[PDB]
Amino acid sequence: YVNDPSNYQLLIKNLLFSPVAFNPEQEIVYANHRRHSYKTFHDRVRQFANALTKMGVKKGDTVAVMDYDSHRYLECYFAIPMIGAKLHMINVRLSPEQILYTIDHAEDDIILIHEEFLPILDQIKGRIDTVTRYVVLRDDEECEYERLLEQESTEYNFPDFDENTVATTFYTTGTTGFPKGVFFTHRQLVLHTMGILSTIGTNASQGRLHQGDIYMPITPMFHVHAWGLPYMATMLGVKQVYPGKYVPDVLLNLIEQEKVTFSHCVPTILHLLLSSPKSKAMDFSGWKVVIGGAALPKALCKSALERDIDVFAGYGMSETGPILSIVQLTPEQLELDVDQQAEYRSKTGKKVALVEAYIVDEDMNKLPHDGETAGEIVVRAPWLTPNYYKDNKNSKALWRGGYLHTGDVAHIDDEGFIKITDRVKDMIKISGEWVSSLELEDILHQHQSVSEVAVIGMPHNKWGEVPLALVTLKEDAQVTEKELLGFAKDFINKGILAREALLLKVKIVDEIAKTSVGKVDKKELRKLHL
Amino acid sequence: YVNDPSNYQLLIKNLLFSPVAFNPEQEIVYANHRRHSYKTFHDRVRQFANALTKMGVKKGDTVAVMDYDSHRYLECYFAIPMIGAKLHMINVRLSPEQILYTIDHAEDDIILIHEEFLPILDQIKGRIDTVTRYVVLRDDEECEYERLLEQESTEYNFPDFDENTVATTFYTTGTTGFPKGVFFTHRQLVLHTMGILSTIGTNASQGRLHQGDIYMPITPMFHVHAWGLPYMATMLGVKQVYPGKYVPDVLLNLIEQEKVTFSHCVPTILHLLLSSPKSKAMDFSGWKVVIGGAALPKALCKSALERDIDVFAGYGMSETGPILSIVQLTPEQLELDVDQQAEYRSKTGKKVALVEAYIVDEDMNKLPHDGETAGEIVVRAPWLTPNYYKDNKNSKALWRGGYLHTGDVAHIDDEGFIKITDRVKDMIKISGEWVSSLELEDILHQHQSVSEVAVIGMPHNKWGEVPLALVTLKEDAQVTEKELLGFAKDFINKGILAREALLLKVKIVDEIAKTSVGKVDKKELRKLHL
């Protein structure tokens, strides 16, 4: 690659070595395990580049990582792409067969794997063909990664290549029959970092990430680049605490002891942290979790705002950066009380710098932002995957009409607030309308005798795709289908016929099929019952 | 231009229509003249695009602007580049012959000119060949720009082109025999905006620009893109106040009445504002001027910090964005008293996100950042001009060794603070060393009987390029050359022989040649005396 120095390329090494701030005595902390400064972190990154080069890793190669959140994962975020290789982030919560599929599909050359994921490997290792080396990672001195790093020099000259070289890849299960692979370039990751820093860095006084913060992730580093936050923290040169495996007591201790002020997580882990007993005597009033990944419920938001936590939501997916929108509150909206707060903070948010985000219908017509007209969200941004790796027909559907299709159904306010209402697939196509299964499920779950409910589409010749319910009861709880029907038929203010209560078809089921991720399997649910 | 929607191009229209924040009721204020909201501003930008298209302006064309800071200049910053044309910003403080040269060199098609610069035009209009239309701008209803805009529609579909299309150009006098033309692309301006927003937006608590600020420029909009601040303010959607022609009373009233909180200026105007009588009864403790363009003196910095002004310096040039470095203070450095503050705040600063900035010697060897070793600053950044327009030999010297040569001589601290010490040309090459003329000039001007001094290089056969002084005395003030020599020879702690006092050669001169910009002409000074 011959480059003229005038033609600036946006590479991840510029992110590491041309930061917003660099303090060589700031520290990276791994749990109660290890602790070292930013000068050691830079040295270790160069050593890791030396070690990878010694193993025969080249510019086009793929190195796969399977570990928890640690300093080693942070070093892989930089060293692998800076040598020109491609970081394949393995989703360890998939089943072994899916994991084997993604390793075969990506064609990894080396696998870095934690010792306590060696049992998943034991049952798929006979079928792996492309992998020449396995490096076992441990939390003590017996780590093979530490031994590899120790015998290398702290010197390395990182190459210059085109900014459009692929940097990372990971696989998303979604709604297809096999996992799909997304990928991003150096330019896209660099631009995601600066775009989000421009958006949440400039907020007047709520929900801002700045150079005085202390960062600790609580959302996996293999999911969406950990929302890109490990890159933005490094760019800001702030203290970074890595908890390892998520255990609520350990997490609460790390927050108290290392004085964490910025995190991301998902509603389940936040509920676990707040409902822990050890959390009752803890000061939380300097902490700023952003909750992405699932809809933040208003009840959880309210419970968190009474502990003085600056909780807010964000939106994104595997195909999109991940960040597309965040909730940011004006000085007047900060004057409201906890209920009007909890309403705003639970929204999907407003779109970030350099994002388009229209709501459209099935034929790609743009719907008004009136506050109630719903449609599918389609986006244009500087950091979207152009297609699925090694895939054509699914890629065409991803980018239909010149926009990226998120698969989520929402309405937008006239002031720009986005409220996701359901999924495109999950929408019931009764008669001629589209009711959301989410609101009906939420109504039914409000019952004092219900633990879970799913809503699916059964058919009808007269009203087409019509609603149906599965309900699961609690300890020694028995409420019939007809009673549930009446309870639902109570409510008012809905569409269709009357307010949609003649097709509820509620059924009580011991269990609802759930994936390995813990999300109810709507595909198998509609396979079994019909 | 055919683009696939996947391939995202970084254009200025995305800056206008994909902001960090958009409030359609936020306002743009022109002095006491006009006031309208952001919704009117977007409408006017589309109208201006319609009007330019009607005049035959095409993608490659050049529109030249000659006005003060106003809303019209802000509209030209967006409309001209968004149609694909090139905005040539005319430096109205140059002499008429230089202005004529730059108009001929750039080959402008249309000229927008304020009525009170029509006398400069009257004497160069006979020699302009390429210009087909002159639009006269006025501060009342008789403006030709307002009439052109009124008869257009508020609708316009802005094209998509390559991100490497040139957006702006302007000319810098510098050290050559004619002005040199620099140019920037859409990608470079967009990246300058996000890089600076990432740097100064994320500061913990001092010197930050955010979405709650009110912006008013006090540095010309034709100089360096006004430090890029008009783009960053628009991106943040904050209130923007344009003062027009700089008069200190009007400026102080605008600060008081519109509640301005962020500005940029140069030391002379700041001294005028602080030394005004009307400024004695004014609250200044929410104002954050950044002083670039010349070295901020410690005495001015101290006088400003006792009025509670958040004053800080920044560094950049016509060839470089303009921003390369800014002073940003840590929470501990904010605990210091006004003297240790005034020391830090007057430094050139630390480099911003995505900037390299080495100090080097004459043969391109990198000098240590020990705190006192000086050398020329050379930089790499995403927003540097690749060459001078229509120029080859000077362009080769600009990028010698694969780095951009700034022409400034500085040392860097081990913590990253840059202190500019002099110019490369102005360095005295006595014997084998390089003394700075700036420190000697500063010493000599400390005298209670001196109004100004210049230091230049006279020659010597024995000590080569040796120092020489020109001094100008005050009202009825007479101090001989020998007395000045003794006064200088007093001081201690310097290099060369003894502490360099045998070649001072001080001469008293009624005047020192000054350019139209007001900067002492070192070239003519060394032409006259030798």
Place this chain on the structure above:
Amino acid sequence: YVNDPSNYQLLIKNLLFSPVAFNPEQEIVYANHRRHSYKTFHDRVRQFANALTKMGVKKGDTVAVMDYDSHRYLECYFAIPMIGAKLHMINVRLSPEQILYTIDHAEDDIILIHEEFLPILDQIKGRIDTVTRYVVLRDDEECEYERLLEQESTEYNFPDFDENTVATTFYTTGTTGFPKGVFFTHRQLVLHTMGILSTIGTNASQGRLHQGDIYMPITPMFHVHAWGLPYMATMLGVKQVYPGKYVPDVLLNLIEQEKVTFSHCVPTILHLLLSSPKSKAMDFSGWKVVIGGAALPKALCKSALERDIDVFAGYGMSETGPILSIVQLTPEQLELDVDQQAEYRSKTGKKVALVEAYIVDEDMNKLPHDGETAGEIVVRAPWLTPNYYKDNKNSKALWRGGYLHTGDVAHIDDEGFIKITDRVKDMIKISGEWVSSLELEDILHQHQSVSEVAVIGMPHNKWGEVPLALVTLKEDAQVTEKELLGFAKDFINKGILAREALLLKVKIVDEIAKTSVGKVDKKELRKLHL
């Protein structure tokens, strides 16, 4: 595609419409189901092209077929490639998960499927994404293919395209973790047809295919193009009988009634046909089966030659045409008695026209054709797959050293006879030598008390990869491991130490893991026991 008529392209349509012989009253017979002449067959091929075009099938598309051997499969062999589409032949003996994988990997647009394979589909249909139409095939009038064909015209102008356009694809399980996809072009299939017709057509008086023969396949049409024989039969214009689903009574009746004279099959089906009772009163002395796919055993060859059957073997794989070599006997070798005959006829054969076929060692050195030195067979021919579809690392290993690696271990005679001795993977790497597991297995199975044996590689620190046995006993049969050891240790004339009897390690096991194809799983066998 613009072609000059001078530049002749080798396309499959030339095979159909420029044959060696065309008799429009010759007939295609499907079992006891249907019967029509070659003029109807050409008309139906044009109708099928019309129907496929009406469904939106284009030049690059993929149509997948899942049926038994019938006239419809023969029509798919021509119509799909002649329109420029790609025929994906689905292996219905794979498990449903593998079938689903190959459908996803190939990205089929339409699926033609027989009604009695609809239960495999029912359990993978929820996970198929790319398929827009399913055409159900039946053996009566209710076939959807017949209905589609009836409403089309018998006219169609077939395009001219490049001869290097892909025509067919199918997937082979082999030794990797997922099935691999091979593909062939029009040129390759045409050249395979003429090369084999040149080889076996010109034989003096044994084992020749000519224009007076009657052809009936007994090896699946989805396996290797049915050894390319359906193309060669059509080219010769001979009568073609398709039996449908292989049932020995039906097959014997078809041979007797339609007077079949040329077939291909595998040893198991031939053993079933010869050992049937209905076969005892059948004249077989005009029939010429070629046995490929597995090694033809000498005992089966001898039993077939006493019924006066012209039995001979052939060699090929999914990656190679399939044909690479056939046994062809000289007039002197036809004078030998049934034992010396059965020896020659069971060999792998000699290579066919335009085939290279060297035996090599692990470092790609060419071994002598002395008659006993063994090595891996590597080939060059006009009809080999250049790589695996969507695959890089496995493709590199397929073509290592500039030759295609078959994975089989054989020695070659000085007269050119090839005798395959084992697989490359199955070779035991004891000490420094390579014994074949096949000869040891054959010895052990000779025991009067054994039903099956497998030999695998257990390890040893002293002799490296050393032999091990699994044995299964017959009805109420019990012979210990030590007795088996002694029985084996009897024999003489072998290598290593003594004659290799100290590491036999025989174990009696109720069952030996078998794949869905019925081939013993050596991979799982070495996974379980070690």
